[PDB]
């Protein structure tokens, strides 16, 4: 049994679990009884129950015994839209709610209990959320999040009763293909994860940030860029005075409408000038004074007029507008509409307390809950303890100027709070690192937004962590991929029924070539070409946030580096990410030995170009025109929706194998040879036929005395091995030195490398 009742769950229950006589045990005999409209919401619970009870017979059905889910509108006043009652009796479990959202949250509580013990104590509890929006900002912006990551993230949020995610992202545009710079998302891909969110009660709100931070949309559209008095544009800012540019944005709004089901639209409205001055663009002031009919209209007025126009437009679609609070500026002939939700993050401009007093609905998008890959925030550096343990902190505490905190007193106008996940540099961290980084903060934010504060039985953060965070494992359905399909080793890489893949400087469809896969702690792979001694990477091409976003970008060979470390929190010791992470690859089991190969941070698939693919990156980028079209047979990276190319990765078949090891690992210049390292190279016969006349050829290297002559082994039988040694001594060379030995047997050729430090 789980005793004390409900002391090991997140969020904690908001009222006490009343104990009753007896218990109830989940077995493979139970059923999840639920109405058909709730089938999709119950599927997660069904799958978890089968995981928990180590079987596969549990189903969701409209009749049966076990766990009953009842949706009863009559309970709307007592439970609200998200409250539930959980009842456990010897006879079974009953979850009651007024709507789907609340019943689902009930299944999360139930699952977390069964996650710890199959036998549950009898009793009942009513659980209700303190705030209506319990949120995350996910900037899938400029850089990309793999669809698998998002699917896992929806599971992460769902199990914690988080119900709101703002996803700043690019949806592949049908009408404006010239603006489809990667990152973008397939429409079907978004429909898929938006559908999962609907089943889990998660409100997915899209964001196209405007009228600033629009580099991703206007790079290839100079005519919609705001221009200086000298006529110079800048893809960062949309010309809000141009009619076709407003039409362009509004078309994007429409395009998003067909895949997002939310009632909200977030136009961003980060400060338009981004630190510049409106006077450098007098056509904004002139547009303002024309549209208001007032001569005293300012540039900030035009910014607010834009905000209001988009407000009316989304309102005509029955939607509600959302903006960041730093988009609320001082005006003259235009006043900001009041039916817009304000997400407050910056301690500047109109105070959040006065905004709430004036009727605005507020989200606490608190800067203390920020995550970034480039410059880590305090919550990453130190964990949430400095907030949890701060009794002057809570959902109702917003940030103010000069480090002051402001308690918004009209709490009823506070919708809730959210944490924020920003990239800033797409290669400093991988997405799987991000997924580890937010673990504690997701639980903390879930706790304070559902409960309205800390659990009463966890005085300090250390207690919350020991009794809850460390005890509540994730749902067994969180993980959705084989994180290490292939073990570390030597493999061949080729197309299904085609040539193999080779790489020296550039990569190409070669033939007869070995690779070495080395798994990484964040569940990626390093692919080392064992002939060229260089690693497959992606570093050359058009970029956003130091990450290659050019479609069709050309993988290339790069010096192999250390890929054994992963970095979260403070990222202590995180150097070399510019080479490390472009070298890392996700390998997705495609069945039958085939594998989708996706770069870890550019998130595009290793592909064989066809000569028939089209994209803007093939013709121009940011006003500068240059043709990069891949020809048929060229090796490239491609978004998921422009390729089915998978890759056959299989352990090597070669009949000969060579291994070279030196002794010592360090060598020093020597006139008697005492610092001379002897590199023993040993050849091994893998298959079943006597190999003869095996030639081992040593390398030749600047500043080293190496035995010049090759050695030959007369015979080696199947499953045997033979050994020959060459001596190396440095002269004026110092530092790391790779030694490549060539082994040739008949038509077959392989190499063996060794490393020696010259001191
Ligand atoms: C509201 C806010 O926090 N704004 C700044 C963030 O700017 C975002 O940056 C991403 C890429 O990193 C997109 O370009 C998005 O459009 C921007 O709004 C910034 O990322 C973080 C700090 O890293 O906070 C603000 O500075
Ligand atoms: Ni316990
Ligand atoms: Ni910025
Ligand atoms: Ni992991």
Alpha helices in 236-281 (DSSP H): 243-257
Question: Rounded to whole angstroms, how far apart are CA atoms 389 and 199?
Answer: 35
Both tokens assigned to 466: 């020991």
- Which residue range is the domain that position 231 belongs to? 133-469
Tell me the ligand closest to 149's alpha carbon: 4
Same domain? For 208 and 318 the reply is: yes
Instruction: State the sign of the Cα–Cα–Cα–Cα dihedral 490, 495, 498, 499.
Output: negative
Of 179, 233, 234, the closest CA to residue 208 belongs to 179
Which method, experimentally, gave rise to this model?
X-ray
Give 136 Cα–ligand 2 centroid separation in angstroms. Answer: 29
479 within some domain: no
Give 2 Cα–ligand 2 centroid separation in angstroms. Answer: 6
87 within some domain: yes
Question: Rounded to whole angstroms, how far apart are CA atoms 109 and 96?
Answer: 13
- Provide the β-strand partners of residue 695: 712, 744
Same domain? For 519 and 621 the reply is: yes
13 within some domain: no
Secondary structure (DSSP) of 276-338 = S-GGG-HHHHHHHHHHHS-TT--HHHHHHHHHHHHHHHHHHTT-EEEEEGGG----SS----S
Resolution of the entry in angstroms:
2.8
Report the Cα 663 to chain-centroid distance in Å.
Answer: 44
Q: What is the CATH number of the domain that holds 623?
A: 2.80.10.50
Alpha helices in 318-460 (DSSP H): 352-357, 378-382, 385-388, 431-437, 439-451
Q: Which atom of ligand 1 lies closest to the CA of 268?
A: 18
Rounded to 5 degrees, φ, ψ at 192 are -60, -60
Pairing of strands 362-364, 414-422: parallel
In contact, 707 and 724? CB cutoff 8 Å: no
Report the Cα 672 to chain-centroid distance in Å.
Answer: 57
Query: How far is CA 10 from each of CA 4, 378, 465, 701, rounded to the nearest angstrom?
Result: 14, 23, 11, 62
712 within some domain: yes
Query: Of 93, 127, 161, which one is at a domain's C-terminal end?
Result: 127
Question: Rounded to whole angstroms, how far apart are CA atoms 177 and 170?
Answer: 12
Q: Per residue, what are the HEC states of 202-251?
A: CEEEEEEEECCCCHHHHCCCHHHECCCCCCCCCCCCECCCCHHHHHHHHH
Question: Rounded to whole angstroms, how far apart are CA atoms 696 and 681?
Answer: 8
Q: What is the DSSP letter of 469?
A: I
Both tokens assigned to 284: 């904004």
Question: Rounded to whole angstroms, how far apart are CA atoms 475 and 113?
Answer: 11
Question: Rounded to whole angstroms, how far apart are CA atoms 135 and 414?
Answer: 13
Q: Which atom of ligand 1 lies closest to the CA of 213?
A: 16
In contact, 464 and 388? CB cutoff 8 Å: yes
Pairing of strands 647-651, 594-599: antiparallel
Question: Rounded to whole angstroms, how far apart are CA atoms 340 and 320?
Answer: 7
Tell me the ligand closest to 421's alpha carbon: 1
Question: Rounded to whole angstroms, how far apart are CA atoms 409 and 357?
Answer: 8
643 within some domain: yes
Give 167 Cα–ligand 1 centroid separation in angstroms. Answer: 13
Report the Cα 532 to chain-centroid distance in Å.
Answer: 32
Q: Which of 135, 136, 139 to mutate to test the pocket of ligand 1 (most atoms within 8 A of CB)?
A: 139
Instruction: State the sign of the Cα–Cα–Cα–Cα dihedral 217, 222, 223, 227.
Output: positive
Same domain? For 503 and 552 the reply is: yes
Give 145 Cα–ligand 4 centroid separation in angstroms. Answer: 16
Kindly compute the dihedral angle of the four CA atoms of residues 381, 382, 388, 392, in this order, to the nearest 10 degrees: -80
Q: Which helix H or strand E contains 157, and what residues bound it?
A: helix 147-159
Same domain? For 696 and 589 the reply is: no
477 within some domain: no
Rounded to 5 degrees, φ, ψ at 586 are -85, 130
Query: Of 127, 148, 181, which one is at a domain's C-terminal end?
Result: 127
Q: What is the CATH number of the domain that holds 38?
A: 3.30.379.10
Rounded to 5 degrees, φ, ψ at 352 are -65, -30
Of 584, 426, 557, 431, the closest CA to residue 503 belongs to 557
C-alpha angle with apex 249: 243 to 254, nearest 5 degrees? 120
Report the Cα 6 to chain-centroid distance in Å.
Answer: 32
- Provide the β-strand partners of residue 597: 587
Contacts of 138 (CB under 8 A, 6+ apart): 145, 150, 153, 165, 166, 167, 168, 421
Same domain? For 292 and 368 the reply is: yes
Same domain? For 102 and 148 the reply is: no
Per-residue burial over 102-122, b if 16 or more Cβ lie within 10 Å, else e, is bbbbbbbbbbbbbbebbebbb
Of 219, 187, 100, 273, the closest CA to residue 619 belongs to 219
Pairing of strands 66-71, 514-519: unpaired
Domain count, the chain: 4
Q: Which of 137, 138, 206, 213 to mutate to test the pocket of ligand 1 (most atoms within 8 A of CB)?
A: 213
Upstream peptide bond of 720 is cis (omega within 30 degrees of 0): no
Same domain? For 309 and 436 the reply is: yes
Same domain? For 247 and 366 the reply is: yes
465 within some domain: yes
Contacts of 676 (CB under 8 A, 6+ apart): 667, 670, 705, 727, 728, 729
Q: How many CA atoms lie within 13 A of 723 on its CB side?
A: 7
Of 606, 634, 632, 609, the closest CA to residue 506 belongs to 634
Tell me the ligand closest to 117's alpha carbon: 2
Question: Rounded to whole angstroms, how far apart are CA atoms 409 and 354?
Answer: 9
Question: Rounded to whole angstroms, how far apart are CA atoms 25 and 338?
Answer: 52
Of 225, 229, 197, the closest CA to residue 212 belongs to 225
Give 213 Cα–ligand 3 centroid separation in angstroms. Answer: 6
Pairing of strands 203-210, 264-268: parallel
In contact, 419 and 476? CB cutoff 8 Å: no
Of 475, 157, 75, the closest CA to residue 85 belongs to 75
Residue ranges lining ligand 1, Cβ < 6 Å: 139, 141-142, 168, 209, 213, 270, 324, 345, 372, 422-424
Same domain? For 638 and 663 the reply is: no
Which residue's CA lies nearest to atom 14 of ligand 1? 213
Edge to edge, the sheet with strand 677-685 lists 656-663, 677-685, 721-730, 704-706
Question: Rounded to whole angstroms, how far apart are CA atoms 634 and 94?
Answer: 60
Q: 439-444, long-range: CB within 8 Å, 24+ apart, which pairs? A: 439/469, 440/383, 440/384, 440/465, 440/469, 441/369, 441/371, 441/379, 441/384, 442/136, 442/156, 442/157, 442/160, 442/162, 443/10, 443/160, 443/468, 443/469, 443/472, 444/384, 444/387, 444/388
Which residue's CA lies nearest to atom 20 of ligand 1? 422
Q: Which atom of ligand 1 lies closest to the CA of 212?
A: 16
| Length reported for the chain | 759
Q: Which residues are catalytic, by number? A: 271
Which residue's CA lies nearest to atom 21 of ligand 1? 422
349 within some domain: yes
Q: Which helix H or strand E contains 159, and what residues bound it?
A: helix 147-159
Question: Rounded to whole angstroms, how far apart are CA atoms 63 and 65?
Answer: 7
Query: What is the crossing angle of helices 100-114 and 39-53, to 10°?
Result: 0
Secondary structure (DSSP) of 456-468 = TT--SHHHHIIII
Question: Rounded to whole angstroms, how far apart are CA atoms 493 and 651?
Answer: 9
Of 84, 72, 77, 159, the closest CA to residue 129 belongs to 84
Kindly compute the dihedral angle of the four CA atoms of residues 20, 22, 26, 27, in this order, to the nearest 10 degrees: -160
Same domain? For 290 and 400 the reply is: yes
Q: Which helix H or strand E contains 665, and what residues bound it?
A: none
Contacts of 467 (CB under 8 A, 6+ apart): 7, 8, 457, 458
- Provide the β-strand partners of residue 407: 397
Q: Which atom of ligand 1 lies closest to the CA of 424?
A: 12
Q: What is the CATH number of the domain that holds 243?
A: 3.20.20.80
Upstream peptide bond of 691 is cis (omega within 30 degrees of 0): no
Upstream peptide bond of 113 is cis (omega within 30 degrees of 0): no
Pairing of strands 119-127, 18-25: antiparallel
Query: Of 107, 127, 147, which one is at a domain's C-terminal end?
Result: 127
Give 422 Cα–ligand 1 centroid separation in angstroms. Answer: 6
Question: Rounded to whole angstroms, how far apart are CA atoms 113 and 48?
Answer: 12
Both tokens assigned to 503: 């790489």
Map tokens 């969110």 to a residue.
Answer: 197
Secondary structure (DSSP) of 78-141 = HHTTT-EEEEEETTEEEEEESSHHHHHHHHHHHHHHHTT-SEEEEEEEEE--S-SEEEEEEEE-
Same domain? For 614 and 637 the reply is: yes
Same domain? For 522 and 560 the reply is: yes
Instruction: List % helix, strand, coil for the chain (3-state, nearest 5).
Output: 25, 30, 45
Give 371 Cα–ligand 3 centroid separation in angstroms. Answer: 15
Question: Rounded to whole angstroms, how far apart are CA atoms 553 and 119?
Answer: 55
Per-residue burial over 268-294, b if 16 or more Cβ lie within 10 Å, else e, is bbbbbbeeeebeebebbbebbbebbee
- Cβ of 609: how many Cβ atoms within 10 Å? 20
Q: Which atom of ligand 1 lies closest to the CA of 207?
A: 16
Q: What is the CATH number of the domain that holds 689?
A: 2.60.40.10
Q: Which atom of ligand 1 lies closest to the CA of 209?
A: 16
Question: Rounded to whole angstroms, how far apart are CA atoms 310 and 699?
Answer: 68
Q: How many helices (H) and strands (E) does the chain have?
A: 16, 43
Pairing of strands 620-621, 18-25: unpaired
Tell me the ligand closest to 468's alpha carbon: 2
Map tokens 């260089």 to a residue.
Answer: 534
């Amino acid at each position: 049994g789980l005793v004390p009742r409900g002391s090991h769950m997140i969020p904690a229950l908001t009222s006490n679990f009343k104990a009753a006589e007896g218990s109830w045990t989940a077995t493979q005999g139970i059923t999840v009884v639920r109405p058909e409209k709730f089938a999709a919401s119950a599927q997660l619970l069904v799958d978890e129950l089968n995981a928990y009870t180590k079987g596969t017979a549990i189903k969701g059905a409209t009749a049966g015994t076990g766990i009953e889910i009842v949706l009863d509108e009559n309970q709307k006043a007592d439970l609200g839209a998200e409250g539930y009652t959980l009842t456990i009796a010897e006879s079974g479990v009953k979850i009651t709610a007024a709507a789907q959202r609340g019943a689902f949250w009930g299944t999360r509580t139930l699952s977390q209990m069964l996650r710890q013990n199959l036998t549950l104590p009898a009793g009942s509890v009513t659980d209700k959320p303190a705030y209506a929006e319990r949120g995350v900002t996910l900037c899938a912006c400029q850089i990309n999040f793999s669809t698998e990551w998002i699917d896992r993230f929806l599971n992460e949020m769902a199990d914690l009763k988080l119900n709101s995610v703002l996803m700043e992202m690019k949806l592949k545009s049908d009408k404006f293909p010239v603006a489809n710079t990667f990152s973008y998302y397939s429409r079907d891909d978004v429909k898929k994860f938006v559908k999962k969110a609907e089943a889990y009660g998660i409100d997915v709100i899209p964001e196209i940030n405007s009228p600033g931070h629009m580099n991703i949309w206007l790079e290839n559209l100079p005519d919609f860029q705001l221009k200086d008095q000298s006529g110079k544009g800048n893809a960062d800012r949309l010309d809000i005075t141009n009619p076709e540019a407003i039409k362009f944005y509004k078309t994007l709004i429409d395009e998003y409408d067909g895949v997002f089901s939310t009632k909200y639209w977030h136009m961003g409205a980060d400060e338009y000038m981004m630190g510049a001055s409106y006077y450098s663009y007098p056509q904004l002031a002139k547009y303002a004074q024309q549209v208001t009919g007032k001569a005293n209209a300012t540039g900030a007025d035009a910014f607010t007029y834009f905000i209001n126009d988009i407000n009316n437009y989304v309102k005509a679609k029955g939607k509600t507008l959302r903006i960041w609070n730093d988009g609320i500026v001082s005006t003259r002939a235009v006043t900001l509409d009041k039916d817009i939700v304000v997400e407050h993050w910056l301690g500047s401009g109109r105070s959040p307390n006065e905004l709430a007093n004036d009727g605005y609905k507020l989200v606490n998008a608190n800067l203390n809950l920020y995550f970034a890959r480039l410059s880590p925030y305090p919550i990453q550096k130190n964990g949430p303890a400095f907030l949890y343990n701060d009794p002057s902190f809570g959902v109702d505490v917003f940030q103010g100027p000069y480090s002051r905190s402001i308690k918004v007193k009209k709490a009823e106008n506070i919708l809730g709070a959210k944490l924020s996940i920003w990239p800033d540099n797409g290669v400093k961290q991988t997405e799987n690192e991000v997924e580890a980084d937010v673990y504690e903060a997701m639980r903390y934010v879930a706790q304070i937004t559902w409960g309205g504060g800390n659990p009463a039985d966890n005085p300090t953060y250390a207690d919350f962590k020991e009794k809850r965070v460390d005890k509540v494992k994730r749902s067994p359905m969180w993980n959705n991929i084989n994180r290490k399909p292939l073990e570390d080793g030597v493999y061949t890489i080729a197309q299904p029924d085609g040539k193999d893949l080779q790489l020296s400087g550039n990569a190409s469809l070669g033939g007869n070539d070995e690779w070495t896969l080395t798994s990484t702690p964040d569940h990626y792979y390093q692919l080392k070409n064992m002939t060229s001694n260089e690693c497959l990477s992606v570093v050359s091409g058009y970029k956003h946030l130091s990450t290659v976003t050019q479609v069709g970008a050309r993988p290339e060979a790069r010096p192999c580096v250390d890929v054994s470390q992963t970095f979260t929190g403070n990222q202590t010791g995180n150097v070399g990410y510019e080479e490390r992470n472009p070298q890392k690859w996700m390998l997705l089991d495609a069945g039958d030995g085939k594998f989708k190969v996706v770069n870890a941070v550019t998130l595009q698939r290793l592909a064989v170009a066809k000569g028939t693919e089209e994209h803007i990156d093939f013709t121009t980028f940011n006003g500068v025109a240059k043709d990069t079209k891949p020809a048929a047979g060229e090796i490239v990276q491609f978004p998921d929706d422009m390729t089915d190319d998978v890759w056959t990765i299989k352990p090597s078949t070669r009949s000969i194998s060579a291994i070279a090891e030196a002794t010592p690992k360090q060598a020093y210049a020597s006139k008697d040879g005492s610092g001379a390292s002897t590199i023993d190279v040993t050849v091994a016969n893998n298959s079943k036929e006597k190999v003869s006349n095996v030639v081992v050829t040593p390398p030749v290297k600047r500043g080293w005395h190496i035995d010049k002559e090759p050695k030959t082994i007369a015979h080696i039988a199947p499953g045997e091995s033979a050994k020959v040694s060459f001596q190396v001594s440095p002269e004026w060379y110092r530092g790391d030195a790779q030694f490549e030995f060539i082994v040739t047997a008949g038509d077959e050729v392989t190499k063996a490398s060794a490393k020696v430090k010259a001191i």
